[PDB]
Amino acid sequence: TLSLQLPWVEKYRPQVLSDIVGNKETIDRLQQIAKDGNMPHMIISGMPGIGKTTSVHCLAHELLGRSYADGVLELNASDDRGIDVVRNQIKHFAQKKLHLPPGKHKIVILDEADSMTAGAQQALRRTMELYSNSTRFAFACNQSNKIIEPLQSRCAILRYSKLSDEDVLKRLLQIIKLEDVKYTNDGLEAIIFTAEGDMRQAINNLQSTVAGHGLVNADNVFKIVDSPHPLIVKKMLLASNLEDSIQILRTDLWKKGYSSIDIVTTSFRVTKNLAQVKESVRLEMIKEIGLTHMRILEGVGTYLQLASMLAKIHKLNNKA
Amino acid sequence: MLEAKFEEASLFKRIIDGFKDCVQLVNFQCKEDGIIAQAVDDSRVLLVSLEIGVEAFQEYRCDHPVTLGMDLTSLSKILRCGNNTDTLTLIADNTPDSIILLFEDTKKDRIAEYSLKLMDIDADFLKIEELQYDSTLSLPSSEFSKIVRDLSQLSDSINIMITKETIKFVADGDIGSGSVIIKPFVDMEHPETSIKLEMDQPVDLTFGAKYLLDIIKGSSLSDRVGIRLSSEAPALFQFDLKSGFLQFFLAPKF
Amino acid sequence: TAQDVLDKIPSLDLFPEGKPNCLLGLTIVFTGVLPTLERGASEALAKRYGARVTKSISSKTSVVVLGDEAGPKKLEKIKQLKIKAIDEEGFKQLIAGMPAEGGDGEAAEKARRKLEEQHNIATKEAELLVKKEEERSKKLAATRVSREEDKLWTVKYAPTNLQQVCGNKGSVMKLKNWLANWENSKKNSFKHAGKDGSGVFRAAMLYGPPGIGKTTAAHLVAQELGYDILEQNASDVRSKTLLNAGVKNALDNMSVVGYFKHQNLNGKHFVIIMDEVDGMSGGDRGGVGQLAQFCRKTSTPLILICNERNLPKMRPFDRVCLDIQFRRPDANSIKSRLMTIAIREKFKLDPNVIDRLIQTTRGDIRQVINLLSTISTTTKTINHENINEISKAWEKNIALKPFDIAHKMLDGQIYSDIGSRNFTLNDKIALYFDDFDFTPLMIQENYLSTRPSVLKPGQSHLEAVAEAANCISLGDIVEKKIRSSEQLWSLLPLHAVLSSVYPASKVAGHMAGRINFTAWLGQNSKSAKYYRLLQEIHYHTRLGTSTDKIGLRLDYLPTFRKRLLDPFLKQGADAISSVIEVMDDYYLTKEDWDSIMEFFVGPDVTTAIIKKIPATVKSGFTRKYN
DNA sequence: TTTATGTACTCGTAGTGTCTGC
DNA sequence: GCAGACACTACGAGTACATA
DNA sequence: TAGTGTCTGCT
DNA sequence: GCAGACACTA
Ligand SMILES: Nc1ncnc2c1ncn2[C@@H]1O[C@H](COP(=O)(O)OP(=O)(O)OP(O)(O)=S)[C@@H](O)[C@H]1O
Ligand SMILES: Nc1ncnc2c1ncn2[C@@H]1O[C@H](COP(=O)(O)OP(=O)(O)OP(O)(O)=S)[C@@H](O)[C@H]1O
Ligand SMILES: [Mg+2]
Numbered sequence A: 001t002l003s004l005q006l007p008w009v010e011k012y013r014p015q016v017l018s019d020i021v022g023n024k025e026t027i028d029r030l031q032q033i034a035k036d037g038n039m040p041h042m043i044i045s046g047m048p049g050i051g052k053t054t055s056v057h058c059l060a061h062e063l064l065g066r067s068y069a070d071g072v073l074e075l076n077a078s079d080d081r082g083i084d085v086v087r088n089q090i091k092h093f094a095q096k097k098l099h100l101p102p103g104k105h106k107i108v109i110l111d112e113a114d115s116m117t118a119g120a121q122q123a124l125r126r127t128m129e130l131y132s133n134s135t136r137f138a139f140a141c142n143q144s145n146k147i148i149e150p151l152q153s154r155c156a157i158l159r160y161s162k163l164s165d166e167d168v169l170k171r172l173l174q175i176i177k178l179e180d181v182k183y184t185n186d187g188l189e190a191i192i193f194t195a196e197g198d199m200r201q202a203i204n205n206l207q208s209t210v211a212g213h214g215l216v217n218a219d220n221v222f223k224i225v226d227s228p229h230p231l232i233v234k235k236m237l238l239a240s241n242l243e244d245s246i247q248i249l250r251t252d253l254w255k256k257g258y259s260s261i262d263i264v265t266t267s268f269r270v271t272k273n274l275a276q277v278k279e280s281v282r283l284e285m286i287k288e289i290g291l292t293h294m295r296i297l298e299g300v301g302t303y304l305q306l307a308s309m310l311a312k313i314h315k316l317n318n319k320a
Numbered sequence B: 001m002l003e004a005k006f007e008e009a010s011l012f013k014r015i016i017d018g019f020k021d022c023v024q025l026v027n028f029q030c031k032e033d034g035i036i037a038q039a040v041d042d043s044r045v046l047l048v049s050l051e052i053g054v055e056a057f058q059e060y061r062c063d064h065p066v067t068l069g070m071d072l073t074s075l076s077k078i079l080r081c082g083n084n085t086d087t088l089t090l091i092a093d094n095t096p097d098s099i100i101l102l103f104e105d106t107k108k109d110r111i112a113e114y115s116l117k118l119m120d121i122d123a124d125f126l127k128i129e130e131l132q133y134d135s136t137l138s139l140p141s142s143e144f145s146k147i148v149r150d151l152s153q154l155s156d157s158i159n160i161m162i163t164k165e166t167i168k169f170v171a172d173g174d175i176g177s178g179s180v181i182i183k184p185f186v187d188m189e190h191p192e193t194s195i196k197l198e199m200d201q202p203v204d205l206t207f208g209a210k211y212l213l214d215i216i217k218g219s220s221l222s223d224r225v226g227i228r229l230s231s232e233a234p235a236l237f238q239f240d241l242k243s244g245f246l247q248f249f250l251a252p253k254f
Numbered sequence C: 001t002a003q004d005v006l007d008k009i010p011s012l013d014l015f016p017e018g019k020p021n022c023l024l025g026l027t028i029v030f031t032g033v034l035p036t037l038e039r040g041a042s043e044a045l046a047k048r049y050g051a052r053v054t055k056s057i058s059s060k061t062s063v064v065v066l067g068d069e070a071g072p073k074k075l076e077k078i079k080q081l082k083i084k085a086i087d088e089e090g091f092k093q094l095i096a097g098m099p100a101e102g103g104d105g106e107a108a109e110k111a112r113r114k115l116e117e118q119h120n121i122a123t124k125e126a127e128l129l130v131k132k133e134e135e136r137s138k139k140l141a142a143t144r145v146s147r148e149e150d151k152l153w154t155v156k157y158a159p160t161n162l163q164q165v166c167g168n169k170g171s172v173m174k175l176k177n178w179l180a181n182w183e184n185s186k187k188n189s190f191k192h193a194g195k196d197g198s199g200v201f202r203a204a205m206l207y208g209p210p211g212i213g214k215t216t217a218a219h220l221v222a223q224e225l226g227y228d229i230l231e232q233n234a235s236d237v238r239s240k241t242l243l244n245a246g247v248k249n250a251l252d253n254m255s256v257v258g259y260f261k262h263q264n265l266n267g268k269h270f271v272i273i274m275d276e277v278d279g280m281s282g283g284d285r286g287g288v289g290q291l292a293q294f295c296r297k298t299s300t301p302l303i304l305i306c307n308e309r310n311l312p313k314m315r316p317f318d319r320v321c322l323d324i325q326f327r328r329p330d331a332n333s334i335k336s337r338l339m340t341i342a343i344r345e346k347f348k349l350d351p352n353v354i355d356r357l358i359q360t361t362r363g364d365i366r367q368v369i370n371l372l373s374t375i376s377t378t379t380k381t382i383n384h385e386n387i388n389e390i391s392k393a394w395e396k397n398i399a400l401k402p403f404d405i406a407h408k409m410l411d412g413q414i415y416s417d418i419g420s421r422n423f424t425l426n427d428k429i430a431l432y433f434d435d436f437d438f439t440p441l442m443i444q445e446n447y448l449s450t451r452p453s454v455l456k457p458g459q460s461h462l463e464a465v466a467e468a469a470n471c472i473s474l475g476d477i478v479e480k481k482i483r484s485s486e487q488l489w490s491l492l493p494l495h496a497v498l499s500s501v502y503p504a505s506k507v508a509g510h511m512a513g514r515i516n517f518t519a520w521l522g523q524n525s526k527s528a529k530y531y532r533l534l535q536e537i538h539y540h541t542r543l544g545t546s547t548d549k550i551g552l553r554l555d556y557l558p559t560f561r562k563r564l565l566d567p568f569l570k571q572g573a574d575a576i577s578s579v580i581e582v583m584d585d586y587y588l589t590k591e592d593w594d595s596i597m598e599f600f601v602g603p604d605v606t607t608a609i610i611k612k613i614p615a616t617v618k619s620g621f622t623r624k625y626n
Numbered sequence D: 001t002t003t004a005t006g007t008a009c010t011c012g013t014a015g016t017g018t019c020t021g022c
Numbered sequence E: 001g002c003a004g005a006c007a008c009t010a011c012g013a014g015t016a017c018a019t020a
Numbered sequence F: 001t002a003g004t005g006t007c008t009g010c011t
Numbered sequence G: 001g002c003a004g005a006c007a008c009t010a
């Protein structure tokens, strides 16, 4: 059996705060915290793939590289987190006497903290309150609403936004020069369009294009990965004629091997996030789409149900 | 810095197993006199005092006085890995983050060198103070332990009365009674099985069940213990150590 | 003089820059919508020049900015009191025409000297710790011969004493007066209290929102009086077993360190400080009932600190303790404290920014200090330009209570064209999902008690109510499908829409009455209890009766009334044996007799009939059966 | 509070085994 | 060798959550 | 001792 | 939304 090369996602993970791209203000604040060293308790939130945990790891590394092994406790969802296995370990780490430089503190990184139990957070409240002189906490979650109110009170909230096309493009070009691979601008814009702000998705798609075809062009990119189904569903719902929506549905979803339940859930999400049409129209569409969703969930998943849902969308849109 | 070579490990293991039940984070102080440790439990009602002289160590060597505040759960976990004939040896470096304790076997093949991380306990000064006690009665530590266990078979009611210049333990409880009258512990045959009371007008006192229940768990160190009672001072149950002393301060419930 | 300038402005009887701090001493109330700046943006520009923006119209209000449409209470209040009104067109020239400092108007002069006094007290205490910092540094240097500035700002700037707290002065003094007089109530055996009424309550309770200072206030009150603080928390277990083995022995025992710390008269006692009572997430294995038992019997002062009191988990704390409520403090004290902190930290923020910072953080002082510490690293100028970005970056998304959810959901503004752009549909879905277990019930309770403002042209209120009720029924069907054997919990957003968003979008507007709690819970509990009693009496009379429990109430029970109550009414006690004969025939006990009477409705209610029966007649009936 | 499976967590208790002691 | 004395795993009861 | 400004519980 | 209590100012 042959060994595998390191994926481009983890090979080109940033090790310093200057290589990470995106929210310039947040990264500049992180670098000023780096210089000062008095890092407060922080919560980092955003949609996946925009550089949340890598920024925390880079900050910890630059803060205490010599003591990353000693005075950094990286607990996470893969590790067992509960009431006792958290309170005992974190209390032992926070009370542990370790000699830092005067501006450095031990860092307890709670990666993927949105899945934590509420009682664990309640104990963490007093842990942070008591041992803030020696240890500092750094949460990182996708959804910041799961963390209880007092923890968000005793923390510095750092919100991460999805990257614009310019930053993902800059990182893609940097990785392309590092890897020395041929590309076309059309393929790069296709990769950016498919990524939708997710840098990890962009890296995965670029690596797949390079390893499957060799030339990063639009044709190869669309060969390996399809256009996202939210966009095709959005243009299916917004089409004028019923025949146009019916044929879009059939060709681009039914003949592409997309499950009916996936199509209905995507339609619900798009209609919830749709903006150009009026609110009451969206509410009526959501009501009838949910009726179709109930029909699908009860077992009747066919093309006829989706066609009927589209017909009801058009009967609502044309105003009787 | 600290090189406290014990002759063997049984006495230290007994000490830790004795006072580990009550307190959870003791603060050892390293001095040329020896080892000083004052510990207060989570309820702020019971205090533990350790004094171990340089005679109790084979080859003790301290250069500068260093504070070594370690946990007792982790210390017990480490000390359960040690034999009996081996020689325990506490080692501390300059400005020590962790304390190194190693066991040397007479088989001359086995060196078990466990390093224990040190906690950051708040710097509390020596609050101890010489005090005069109204009642001071002593008896063999096993006898006191079993009598106190019999008293603590009941919930919390303990009574000691010194009427007619004779010591009776007429204790009560929620359901049942623990009124075990003890005979005057005098025996010329065994000098250790003796009693001695300093009167100073004693009346009575009531303690807590878990308090003395944790006091009597350190019975292994001393053959007899001097129970002390004071009206306006914290109580004292001082065990006798060959090179130092071991006393457990306590506040009588009111 | 501001008043002279305001007179020259042409009022209404139906944008450029300006000098800094020019609207000082001026009260601004916003009504309607303005063509150029929306209400939030105009309020930002209103506060840009140090003008207080009250949320309610008053008689002492100086000038009101008028828009297009708002609450009818504001429209009727402005007309009758003849208050000065200036439109948005006059607002633009107000900024350029008003000179700095607000002129020499009486209101402006009073506001400035109060603002100067706020800056004066800020400077007075700025060097208080600086002198203290020099004091400890000299003492620390002497001790070294014979860590600071690397600490969280919420810790170094903690209130040293009770005079450094910000807000809740009355609650703090109430707690201090309860603690200082606990021994007096102990001498009186907690029988008679004082004027305040804290004497009877052995233990005091603290509850309030996060960050306002409950823990700090309790610790400072305990420390000032000289007591020994015995504190527990959620970091260690506080179940029944270790509560019985822990602080239970501390109820009548003193500090061992108390003797060795000594004039002090309270240095040898315990003040039990249980922070985070909400961490006892146990109905039975939790220690909430155990803490109630401590409130019953304890020989030492005891204090509890929690955040929300009204949870069903913490129900046994209803009438147990001196309930001391903390609240969000007003912006002036935090303004002074932040001025002191900013002076001490060599970074400057505008004084008017502090109000927006407090409004963003919802009265969380500690989070305000955290915000200041985070911003001050790179952005050293917290001013008019950065405040919007700071607010929209650090906005606190606090989950809403059910009543606030209902009030927010039945508003006609968020379903308008302009309103829905700011508050999108996903926002309404999240608003439902804050309290999804109670939201549909709260919508159904009071969706027909509000005056609609989103009515379609030609659509009456009753038609909108009918549509909302139809969608509520559809949402109920979806809810039954969700909570069933299949457990289709992926279907939750459809239920969200159908049960809260669509019904409210048809009848949204202004509430005619008040937000009422759902009546379905109490009526459902009553119906379940009545079903239990119906089953009990049905199976008591099961023998000889060929009729199920449904037919018992509909048919049999009305006939039993005229065999078991009419003899009591038409002949009194003379038919005591006949009633017992019928009651014994169907294996009916005395308890079943009272149970049957409560099943009737309308004109057959027997509660008044039994009451009118003399007690002598009813007394014999009970005795004969026994 | 009702809601009706399945999952995850937490706690408490009962057995189950091994180490000290006489 | 036998009876405790201990710490250990395992089972059972109860609470809480379930879409972003 | 009496007008606002504002935070808060209603089950 | 409907009170209801706690403040600052008068
Ligand atoms: N701003 C960024 N600059 C550079 N690389 C980035 C950036 N954001 C993501 N990446 C890359 O994305 C990959 C993994 O990103 P992560 O930061 O681990 O994702 P994440 O932010 O943790 O999101 P989740 O919620 O944890 S899935 C690595 O290859 C990173 O190099
Ligand atoms: N009234 C106040 N005045 C000044 N600073 C305050 C005030 N309240 C809180 N703080 C600051 O916030 C820090 C922590 O406040 P806490 O009293 O711990 O908050 P809390 O009331 O306990 O809320 P919890 O317990 O976290 S839910 C203090 O050290 C101060 O720096
Ligand atoms: Mg991550």
Ligand SMILES: [Mg+2]
Residues within 6 Å of the ligand: C214, C215, C275, C276, C305
């Ligand atoms: Mg607190």
